Amino acid sequence: SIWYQTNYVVPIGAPNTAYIIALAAAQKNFTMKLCKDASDILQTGTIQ
Amino acid sequence: ETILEVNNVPTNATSLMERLRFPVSAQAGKGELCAVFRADPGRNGPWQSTLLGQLCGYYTQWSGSLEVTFMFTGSFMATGKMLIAYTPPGGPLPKDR
Amino acid sequence: GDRVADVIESSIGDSVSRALTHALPAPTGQNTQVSSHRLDTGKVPALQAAEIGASSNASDESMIETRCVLNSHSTAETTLDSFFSRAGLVGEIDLPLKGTTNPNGYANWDIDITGYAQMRRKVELFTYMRFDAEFTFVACTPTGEVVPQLLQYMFVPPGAPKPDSRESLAWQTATNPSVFVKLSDPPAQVSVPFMSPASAYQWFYDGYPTFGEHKQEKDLEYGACPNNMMGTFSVRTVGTSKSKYPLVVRIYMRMKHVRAWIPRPMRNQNYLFKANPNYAGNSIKPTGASRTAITTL
Amino acid sequence: EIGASSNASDESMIETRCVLNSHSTAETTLDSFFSRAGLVGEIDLPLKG
Amino acid sequence: GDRVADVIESSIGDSVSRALTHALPAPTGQNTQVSSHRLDTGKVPALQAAEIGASSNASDESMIETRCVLNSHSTAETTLDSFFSRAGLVGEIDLPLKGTTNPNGYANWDIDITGYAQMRRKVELFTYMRFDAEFTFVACTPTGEVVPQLLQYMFVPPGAPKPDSRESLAWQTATNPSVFVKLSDPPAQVSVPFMSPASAYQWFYDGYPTFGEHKQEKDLEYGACPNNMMGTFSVRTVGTSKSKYPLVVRIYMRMKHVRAWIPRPMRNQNYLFKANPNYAGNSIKPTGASRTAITTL
Amino acid sequence: SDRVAQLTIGNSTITTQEAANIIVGYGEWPSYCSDSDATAVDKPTRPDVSVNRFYTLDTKLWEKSSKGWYWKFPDVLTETGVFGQNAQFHYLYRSGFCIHVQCNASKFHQGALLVAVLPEYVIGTVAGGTGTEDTHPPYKQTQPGADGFELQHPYVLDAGIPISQLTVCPHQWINLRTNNCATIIVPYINALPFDSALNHCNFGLLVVPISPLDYDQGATPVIPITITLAPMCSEFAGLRQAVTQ
Amino acid sequence: SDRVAQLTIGNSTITTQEAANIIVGYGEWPSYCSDSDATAVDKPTRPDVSVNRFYTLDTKLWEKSSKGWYWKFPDVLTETGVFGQNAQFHYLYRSGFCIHVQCNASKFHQGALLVAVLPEYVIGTVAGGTGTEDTHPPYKQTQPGADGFELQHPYVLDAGIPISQLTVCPHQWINLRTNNCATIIVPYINALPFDSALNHCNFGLLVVPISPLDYDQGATPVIPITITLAPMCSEFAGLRQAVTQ
Numbered sequence A: 001s002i003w004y005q006t007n008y009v010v011p012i013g014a015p016n017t018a019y020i021i022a023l024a025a026a027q028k029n030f031t032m033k034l035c036k037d038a039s040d041i042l043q044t045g046t047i048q
Numbered sequence B: 001e002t003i004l005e006v007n008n009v010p011t012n013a014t015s016l017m018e019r020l021r022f023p024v025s026a027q028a029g030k031g032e033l034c035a036v037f038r039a040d041p042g043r044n045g046p047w048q049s050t051l052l053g054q055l056c057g058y059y060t061q062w063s064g065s066l067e068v069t070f071m072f073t074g075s076f077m078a079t080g081k082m083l084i085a086y087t088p089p090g091g092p093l094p095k096d097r
Numbered sequence C, E: 001g002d003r004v005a006d007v008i009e010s011s012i013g014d015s016v017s018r019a020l021t022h023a024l025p026a027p028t029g030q031n032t033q034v035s036s037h038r039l040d041t042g043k044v045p046a047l048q049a050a051e052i053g054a055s056s057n058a059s060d061e062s063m064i065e066t067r068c069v070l071n072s073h074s075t076a077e078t079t080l081d082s083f084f085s086r087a088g089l090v091g092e093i094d095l096p097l098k099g100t101t102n103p104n105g106y107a108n109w110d111i112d113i114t115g116y117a118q119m120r121r122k123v124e125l126f127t128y129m130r131f132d133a134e135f136t137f138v139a140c141t142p143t144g145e146v147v148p149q150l151l152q153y154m155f156v157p158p159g160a161p162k163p164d165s166r167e168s169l170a171w172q173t174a175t176n177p178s179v180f181v182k183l184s185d186p187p188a189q190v191s192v193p194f195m196s197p198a199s200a201y202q203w204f205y206d207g208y209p210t211f212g213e214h215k216q217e218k219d220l221e222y223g224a225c226p227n228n229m230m231g232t233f234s235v236r237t238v239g240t241s242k243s244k245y246p247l248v249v250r251i252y253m254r255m256k257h258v259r260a261w262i263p264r265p266m267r268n269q270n271y272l273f274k275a276n277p278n279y280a281g282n283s284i285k286p287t288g289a290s291r292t293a294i295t296t297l
Numbered sequence D: 001e002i003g004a005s006s007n008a009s010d011e012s013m014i015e016t017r018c019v020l021n022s023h024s025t026a027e028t029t030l031d032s033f034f035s036r037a038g039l040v041g042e043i044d045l046p047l048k049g
Numbered sequence F, G: 001s002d003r004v005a006q007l008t009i010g011n012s013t014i015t016t017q018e019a020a021n022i023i024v025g026y027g028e029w030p031s032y033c034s035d036s037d038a039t040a041v042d043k044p045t046r047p048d049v050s051v052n053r054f055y056t057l058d059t060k061l062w063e064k065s066s067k068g069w070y071w072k073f074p075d076v077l078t079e080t081g082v083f084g085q086n087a088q089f090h091y092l093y094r095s096g097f098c099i100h101v102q103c104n105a106s107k108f109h110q111g112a113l114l115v116a117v118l119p120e121y122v123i124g125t126v127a128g129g130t131g132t133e134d135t136h137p138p139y140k141q142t143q144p145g146a147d148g149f150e151l152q153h154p155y156v157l158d159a160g161i162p163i164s165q166l167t168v169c170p171h172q173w174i175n176l177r178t179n180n181c182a183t184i185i186v187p188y189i190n191a192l193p194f195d196s197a198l199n200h201c202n203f204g205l206l207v208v209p210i211s212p213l214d215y216d217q218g219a220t221p222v223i224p225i226t227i228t229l230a231p232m233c234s235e236f237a238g239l240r241q242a243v244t245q
């Protein structure tokens, strides 16, 4: 969860709204196991 | 790192690029809530936009710490302090800061 | 740094679990040693105090005059692998033509071996078990006849798409393991590893899988531990058209490389459901045969 | 903006204990991922068609 | 024993309080060294950042061209003992003949020195103080006359019976310390040790002396710390009959062997009560003199 | 010399002059989780004395017709003292236990209680009597809290298993003519290094009279049975707000 | 290099890119009580990470006319997280504190807050105005809890002493054109080794605007001030039932 600790303060002349971009990934202690097919299958009918 | 679609609400084609970023703006100083999302990487939701989330779908089990880096794209003159929290299992959606 | 005495001398953090007993080699039954009459005071092997919680330490030698007996009887057939490494039925999957169950030429079976008493009672002697396994699939028609039909078995791990039909895209099986075999071939057979996220599977879990209120409608989840749910086993006739023959698939499991912890009392009431130890209250029967009087055979 | 992923680790963001991680990375190698037979073609040879 | 790494390497228990500053000897004021013009970039002693919370480090030498000055001025008169070891009035006890106060020839005085501004303001510069003291008792009639009257002063520690009259049995003083002296003798004088149960007396205690609800009628106890209440000082004329003369006893205290901790701002509003820092709200005056304009003297 | 005993841990001390030794379950003492078995990365909190002490939670009355009772651990303590708080504020928990069941009578009373510890004590229902209804035990029966719960059918331990074989678990007997208490020390038992003190009960404590209590008219008829227990080597992790369930 | 900073303790981390160094009160770091200064004999409990972490308790709004506020320690935390529980269950308590007052604005705003720590901050009353009534401050004013309390007469710190000399106490200033936070570390201050966290407040935190907040119409007018604090080297003793006061 993300909360406002203080407040987005800006002076006269600058936008009252700005955006944040989130970038995620895994740490170096991350591993995976038990290979399986993905939940999605990107095909409806036959691919011609 | 890949872009996490925290703001996964818009669905019409013309507004899809808006999922890539969420906003912040001048508030009323009441420690208001900005956004929330589950940290589950292999679960439907924001994580599905990341390469981690997709690769994750090819494996039944995972283990490890995750990391999310937030980049503020406001103007240089804009300032602010945010509280980003991670609530381990059992803790319900925090009602307040 | 640590300066106050109570901190320096504390045992907070000791990861070495002190053990009071150690395993010794016992390939054969213990021998019997010679013994003679003993008319002593102070010595009293026959007298015990069961309250303590330990079994009697009294031996043959101390209760009667014994001879010497060199016991060479082996203890090998009572090891865990010897006991469990015997293939037994743990699943049956029906693929009928005209039916109420699977009249679509495919079937999904939740991997749970608790639907069969013989096997179930054996494993439930232990609380935790870690092991690998060898699965064998015996297929034929309901009369036990063998027909030229090709089948596909596929392992669908939790999170992978479960086929919804005989023609599902999921049968492309690009990542899931699949086995293609004919009913005419010998039984298919494969080795399966220990796949739980836990250090061991457990036949008993006294708790709930999630947090929150546990109201009536959610009591179906008491005792459900995801760590035991390994996924789905799917089977289909390999064709876009319905098979000409009704089929039956019997699934046999043979554990190997077994380890078990915490023994428990053995089931003495008939099983009713896979998911729990529920028993029929109106039919609580004694563990065994009964007689008319304690003073008569 | 630099283009690199965060270098921040668990140890530097919170007080951590020692954990000896023995989890294998073997099942995520290229061969482990791709060396699984999958359908890539279907050829029909019907009688009347 | 301790085995897990986080326990072995923890600092939980360090009783050695790391100090960032150490006291140096300073018997005299610092000397001034010679200095010359400096026309540098990067160097900037005059510029400070008060926000940090520290005082300026800029010195005379770095702000102007100075000569050499050997400063031999002493710092001795500003030590704690030099400042406090000066006897001052801390109590007055009246023993009138015909009166409304103590017309019985005896009086009980609660040992509290906060009834006198001069002394009080000095000690309140520090939060905690540990010291011994020398008490001097000056007695005479109200005109300052000396009369042949014998008196008895007695120290009644908390828990000892407070005399209830001039003839009380408590004046037997078998264990309490008492001083018998005539108004004609020089002032009585004795040494008192540091008697608190705490490592130091404290002129400010932000709390309550007991647990429980702290309702209106009990707010009289906010700030009351028993550790500062050393007992009662009792005085009487020595006789079963009333004295023929009215008396006044002035109590002077001179601290010695003083130690103080945590300096505080100094009182700037008139004192009103012994027990608290209450001030007159309708008369909040500036700390000092004022003027008409900031640009005029 | 094996009959007398004192158990001191934390700020609590227990005494007994009619004991029957001490049982250390499965032959091993409670120990903190090693750095190799552990998986969670955050530094744990090990309160020590404030939580590893003797708590006396409940007292039942033994009667000529009592059936027996059971308590679940750590369910019984989740709402008591500093241990409870730590169990609520933290997601992860692990610890051992020292259980001391008390019950004294006179040299003229008789009876025998079996005191045992059964790991993963899953409870079952009578399935509607005929065994056709797939009923399930309610939260108040699976996690009875400190009041424990009374066995409906002791012979099968309300779980379809013979109580006659319960002795295969760490246990002691309280035979009135012999002792007035049982003492069992239990290490952490689970297939995981830490778990939720709320959602998972590692084991259950069973106190069942196998030999019925008896005495003649005129002897004190009120024979209590008290349960005292102390956590051991308590470790907690995954901090956040308190949660009761 | 003195402007940037990260404070990590427990499972909490604070960052700032406009700091003004760190103040360590009276020149010394918090330390656990030594075996020679101690007097209580029971073994203490030192929770460590579960209690020594950053807690963000309150947010006030700085205005062109604000007078200033104060909070009492450890009063502010007695009802929060695991620290609160330990402070309630135990008679004795001692610890240090790391205080981080936050307040950011824009390069076009101006103002200066004085952030200080005053030990034994005893509060006084206006004595009925004329100074004849011997009034006393109510419990809600002496121990305001987490909401703190607003100064009635800042010039004299509601205690008859000049705020102009408050700088003689550990302090920092939050001058908007210079920094957006103050950081003060405070050791245990008392004439005793341990004390009640309930009946005695070791010190008070004062946040008073000396130079009034100002800005032109059009700039964000909502300038919050948030209080985050972390106990350090917390030690507790004299265990028993929980008590709120």
Ligand SMILES: C[C@H](CCOc1ccc(I)cc1)CCN1CCN(c2ccncc2)C1=O
Binding pocket: C111, C112, C113, C114, C133, C135, C154, C155, C190, C192, C201, C202, C203, C204, C228, C229, C230, C233, C274
């Ligand atoms: C050995 C099986 C897993 C077999 O996995 C596969 C996987 C692929 C294939 I091809 C064949 C079998 C697990 C059996 N277990 C693990 C514990 N468990 C269980 C069932 C009901 N209640 C508790 C535990 C249970 O049924």
Ligand SMILES: C[C@H](CCOc1ccc(I)cc1)CCN1CCN(c2ccncc2)C1=O
Binding pocket: E111, E112, E113, E114, E133, E135, E154, E155, E190, E192, E201, E202, E203, E204, E228, E229, E230, E233, E274
């Ligand atoms: C030096 C005195 C004790 C004098 O004790 C004796 C004892 C015997 C005799 I004969 C004379 C004097 C204590 C003074 N103090 C200690 C602190 N204190 C106090 C008063 C009001 N508010 C806080 C503290 C206060 O008034």
